[PDB]
Design a protein around this ligand. Sequence first.
Ligand SMILES: [Zn+2]
Length: 221
Amino acid sequence: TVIKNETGTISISQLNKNVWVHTELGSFNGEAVPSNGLVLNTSKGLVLVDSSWDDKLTKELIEMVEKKFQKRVTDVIITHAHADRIGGIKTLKERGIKAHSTALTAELAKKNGYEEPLGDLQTVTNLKFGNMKVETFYPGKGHTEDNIVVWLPQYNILVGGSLVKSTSAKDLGNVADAYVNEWSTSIENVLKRYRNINAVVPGHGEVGDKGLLLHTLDLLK
Ligand SMILES: [Zn+2]
């Protein structure tokens, strides 16, 4: 289930047959800062939900999964325009890895000096990679104005991203780019759209269930 790398900075934990969570530790702020993403093992190659803090980590992550699953990373879904999500955009672009995002995430990325992801995702976009079905959903502003969630309909698995706080998060964290008055409605939009969720992957911390969305709503009070 769990697989680390050279230094411990990169680890992958299996949720299921074709779905794994990737977690990388940062260096700026706290003393570690562990971000989560997903690795989708499809029949057409590997698909990642979010990159990492920087190019160095993004390269390692890619090389780790490509060697392990014996297929190439073909696409990446960027959940918002913050560093730990879009930091390795330069690596993805130069290797020919498709970087999907909403037009708003792309716009913000460019404004902040990062290379632009595709800006192809709408409010609701349905993608399919080989066998793997993936739906992206913009539920409104919250953690950032552009944050989106990712849903795997075949597993009822929701990648909540930074819009969703783990049980360990006792506060909202970085709210510099957040919309605390709209974040609750956005969370409600997710709950209304996905009434039956098996697992919820937060932007950082332990995987949980619908309870993390409820936990986030409480943190917003
Ligand atoms: Zn963020």
